[PDB]
Write a protein that binds this ligand. Structure first.
Ligand SMILES: *[C@@H]1O[C@H](CO)[C@@H](O[C@@H]2O[C@H](CO)[C@@H](O[C@@H]3O[C@H](CO[C@H]4O[C@H](CO)[C@@H](O)[C@H](O)[C@@H]4O)[C@@H](O)[C@H](O[C@H]4O[C@H](CO)[C@@H](O)[C@H](O)[C@@H]4O)[C@@H]3O)[C@H](O)[C@H]2NC(C)=O)[C@H](O)[C@H]1NC(C)=O
Ligand SMILES: *[C@@H]1O[C@H](CO)[C@@H](O[C@@H]2O[C@H](CO)[C@@H](O)[C@H](O)[C@H]2NC(C)=O)[C@H](O)[C@H]1NC(C)=O
Ligand SMILES: *[C@@H]1O[C@H](CO)[C@@H](O[C@@H]2O[C@H](CO)[C@@H](O)[C@H](O)[C@H]2NC(C)=O)[C@H](O)[C@H]1NC(C)=O
Ligand code: NAG
Ligand code: NAG
Ligand code: NAG
Ligand code: NAG
Ligand code: NAG
Ligand code: NAG
Ligand code: NAG
Ligand code: NAG
Ligand code: NAG
Lengths: 460, 123, 123, 123
């Protein structure tokens, strides 16, 4: 006859909500006695069988720019990073004035000797010690033309908390798992432009392998694409929104260094010892990064022919960074526990006008691109609340046989009748890397209650 | 089928799978956050169970209530609802009317229970 | 009695002691552990009660289902099971096949509810 | 009318107001106290629900149980009990004999369930 309402429990309907998430790590990350920095004592392990079920005919809108897991991941990384430097050595008795000269006979033109006095394990006795501090960690306090007085940089503003020499900065993968009563929708569309509907949504509980790499201006190890180069942006109208280029073919990049002596152990009290840079044996060279020439050339050509779809009659150009200090204009990362800040002058020096150039030469692979750069030791990252460190050095030489995944670009402001616009690389906020690694997923809440029309009559 | 096996399937065929989406509602730095989330999940399930039990539909998945359905709410034929539509569009176009439906179910349960105690007391 | 009074007695004599045993499922450094233990006790009880509530045996200590009993699970006679076997080795023997029984009760409950819905909507 | 509508009224007058008095059982430094009060509310509601659910009176006010009433608990007639005395002093004089009563209802409910088991298995 007429419609009578009936209640249903166990109904698959969805809403958008913001809740905290869990961890998930591999089984090999718990047998290590170095305790890592994230996945040994806090994060829970996962099962070795990630079940994924594809849904039939559902279309769901995705917005990777207005996301909750990016902000939660950033807050969790910041909090877990600040909690891992509390039981470590603090370099408060190192703000004494340093007397610094050239590095012996035949100076290296990059380090200063910087001999000082320090308090030993006895509170009365003091001893004269020496090191080799890097030049960007040395500030010339002066009142006249004095070339022998120097001090450390982090004693001026806030703290000198050294990292512990047991943990490591190795980026092992982690997975984010939704809590009970929540699911994660993942879009499998290959032509996903970042915002809009998706028609191959699959429901998963735990995310795939995410490596929280510390990098700016250029993306390190990460997940590749499937079909072609993908452009990620939210408006593509103004010049103040960072655009992400997601690649398809990796390009090999290595970074090397000359030798050092050892970790010179200097005591500043009971138990608190720090490892400074000792001597340098052998000849001194530069710390450089090598990138293949023809792979970078046809990769940038592929980026050009794919980016020409959004600009039909305009040529693209590249040049240097748009000014600033050391920390923002250089591609910065870390390897083996030592940080690198490297100039990108020889990578973004070119232009594309729409005419493709084919590179067919087998013997031309010998030519490479070299990036010469220096090393810092005190890191002021996260653009605030960073808990200013002092990275301990490594004894021998190191290698950085790495992989490249994406690029971060920013358009410059043009003038009238400017048909040739430029794209300069820039980093800035840390959220861009984890936003590039979390475009697929979206947290979702299920409501098991519902109503439906039928002809059910409850008996009395 | 596990999570959301019939989230876009046939309306008549989505009534055979409510058990698997209802079986799994409970299954220092991070000693408080997961605790708060777990207690929140427990109270979400308990609120759902109490809301089911407040109109006499506890322990039964598909329960029936004698309150009628007004023509100003859906005005659509039953056959193509149960054979063509899905749950998500139904939640899209019914969720603005849910509170008065819940109130009607509560009033109908109150009337049914008051007739039940009147019949028990008069006998 | 008390905590598991008929913990080793006859199978038949252990069916009249369900009430006095299931009643006790809810009754700084040393402040986190007590609260966590209380929350996980609530977790275990709510999981057990929900699992009883899926297959239509909510609020009943002893409930009967209409699923057939396959002989390949036990292959044993009823009389010596109910008069000679303690619950412990019985649960040890059936522990290799509990998920099949849970799925069969779930499917039988859903099928019985759909037949009841068809019979009730037929009128 | 929410909490304690007729807390000092007649025994028989409190029977018609039971449907409105028991409706609100669930409806840094100052975050831990909120968590503890939240968990304690969950404990109270779940304990009350299971204790009402052991002796077969789940989701039903004014439940009748076939256990006989012993004369050693009150030894006074029901007329002046139901039209003379309020709830509080009656609870004061009944509080010494609550565990024996709870055990008697538990045993009666379990025996009733076994009788229903034998009756349905007799067919
Ligand atoms: C992007 O991806 C690349 C490749 O996946 C990563 O490169 C790896 O980086 C890690 C560290 O960042 C390297 O691990 C280190 O290797 C050093 C040399 O390894 C050789 O020698 C050892 C024996 O000494 C052999 O077992 C090994 O197979 C190699 O032949 C080691 O000396 C290092 O040891 C240090 O760490 C351990 C544990 O923390 C300490 O106990 C030691 O005392 C010492 O301090 C370390 O194991 C790894 O070798 C690199 N891979 C390759 C192929 O070279 C990038 O790091 C990654 N990220 C970025 C940003 O580029
Ligand atoms: C930095 O200066 C110190 C002191 O001026 C140097 O330490 C001396 O090194 C010579 C070797 O040339 C030794 O003979 C002395 O005994 C050292 N004096 C000490 C330890 O008090 C140190 O070599 C200089 N650093 C560098 C890199 O040359
Ligand atoms: C102590 O820190 C302050 C910043 O809080 C320094 O002020 C500026 O520092 C930058 C970075 O080296 C310089 O480029 C500027 O020239 C500094 N001055 C101004 C007015 O911006 C300050 O110089 C530091 N103290 C010393 C002695 O160097
Ligand atoms: C999804 O809906 C379309 C619309 O009729 C239907 O043809 C298709 O079979 C559905 N998919 C599944 C898996 O049922
Ligand atoms: C440091 O302490 C020593 C004590 O031996 C003293 O001789 C010296 O003048 C002090 N200052 C410097 C700058 O070395
Ligand atoms: C959706 O993604 C899955 C992932 O394996 C794939 O198998 C399937 O073909 C995709 N759907 C379509 C229509 O391509
Ligand atoms: C950003 O996008 C909105 C709509 O997509 C548009 O109206 C607005 O003009 C854009 N911003 C700029 C600076 O053009
Ligand atoms: C890049 O920026 C510099 C800054 O002075 C400018 O001179 C140059 O024309 C720009 N373009 C190229 C292709 O170098
Ligand atoms: C990078 O290299 C260019 C040319 O080699 C040079 O002009 C510039 O000063 C270097 N440094 C930075 C931070 O751009
Ligand atoms: C860029 O490339 C041109 C062409 O090879 C070269 O002449 C120039 O030195 C390069 N570097 C800069 C900073 O322009
Ligand atoms: C640098 O270290 C690697 C091993 O980490 C070694 O194979 C290589 O020979 C070293 N470089 C030099 C110049 O010795
Ligand atoms: C990067 O590329 C090299 C060779 O192309 C490969 O061996 C390596 O596994 C790649 N990195 C990752 C993280 O897959």
């Amino acid at each position: 006859e007429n419609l009578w309402v009936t209640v249903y429990y166990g109904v698959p309907v969805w809403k958008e909500a913001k809740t905290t998430l869990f961890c998930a790590s591999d089984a090999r990350a718990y047998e290590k006695e170095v305790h890592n920095v994230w996945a040994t004592h806090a994060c829970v392990p996962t099962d070795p069988s990630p079940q994924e079920l594809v849904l039939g005919n559902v279309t769901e809108n995705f917005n990777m720019w207005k996301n909750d897991m990016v902000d939660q991941m950033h807050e969790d990384i910041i909090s877990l990073w600040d909690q891992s430097l509390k039981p470590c050595v603090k370099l408060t008795p190192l703000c004494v004035t340093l007397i610094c000269s050239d590095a012996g006979s035949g100076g290296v033109e990059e380090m200063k000797n910087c001999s000082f006095n320090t308090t030993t394990e006895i509170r009365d006795k003091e001893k004269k010690e020496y090191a080799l501090f890097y030049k960007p960690d040395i500030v010339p306090l002066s009142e006249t033309n004095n070339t022998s007085e120097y001090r450390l940089i982090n004693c001026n503003t806030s703290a000198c908390t050294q990292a512990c020499p047991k943990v490591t900065f190795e980026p092992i993968p982690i997975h984010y798992c939704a809590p009970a009563g929540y699911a994660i929708l993942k879009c499998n569309d290959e032509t996903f432009n970042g915002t809009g509907p998706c028609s191959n949504v699959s429901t998963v509980q735990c995310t795939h392998g995410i490596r929280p790499v510390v990098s700016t201006q250029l993306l390190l190890n990460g997940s590749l694409a499937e079909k072609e180069i993908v452009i990620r942006s939210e408006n593509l109208t103004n010049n103040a929104k960072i655009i992400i280029v997601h690649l398809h073919t990796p390009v090999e990049i290595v970074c090397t260094r000359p030798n050092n002596n050892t970790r010179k152990s200097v005591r500043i009290g009971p138990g608190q010892t720090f490892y400074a840079t000792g001597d340098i044996i052998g000849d001194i060279k530069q710390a450089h990064c090598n990138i293949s020439e023809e792979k970078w050339n046809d990769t940038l050509q592929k980026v050009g022919i794919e980016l020409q779809k959004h600009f039909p009659n305009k040529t693209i150009k590249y040049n240097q960074s748009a000014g600033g200090d050391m920390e923002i204009t250089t591609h910065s990362f870390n390897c083996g526990g030592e940080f690198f800040y490297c100039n990108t002058s020889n990578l973004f020096n070119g232009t594309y006008n729409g005419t493709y150039i084919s590179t067919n030469s087998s013997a031309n692979s010998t030519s490479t691109i070299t990036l010469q750069c220096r090393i810092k030791q005190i890191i002021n990252m996260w653009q605030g609340v960073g808990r200013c460190m002092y990275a301990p050095p490594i004894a021998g030489n190191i290698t950085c046989r790495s992989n490249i995944t994406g690029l971060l670009l920013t358009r410059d402001g043009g003038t009238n009748s400017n048909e040739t616009e430029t794209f300069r690389p820039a980093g800035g906020d840390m959220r861009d890397n984890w936003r590039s690694e979390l475009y697929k997923y979206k947290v979702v809440k299920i409501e098991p209650l519902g109503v439906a029309p039928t002809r059910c009559k409850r008996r009395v | 089928l596990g999570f959301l096996g019939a989230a876009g399937s046939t309306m008549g065929a989505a009534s055979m799978t409510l058990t698997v989406q209802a079986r799994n509602l409970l299954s220092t730095v991070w000693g408080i956050k997961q605790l708060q989330a777990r207690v929140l999940a427990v109270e979400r399930y308990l609120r759902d169970q109490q809301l089911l039990g407040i109109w006499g539909c506890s322990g039964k998945l598909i329960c029936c209530t004698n309150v009628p359905w007004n023509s100003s709410w859906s005005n659509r034929n039953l056959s193509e609802i149960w054979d063509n539509m899905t749950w998500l569009q139904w939640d899209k176009e019914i969720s603005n009317y849910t509170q008065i439906i819940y109130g009607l179910l509560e009033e109908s349960q109150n009337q049914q229970e008051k007739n039940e105690q009147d019949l028990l007391a008069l006998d």
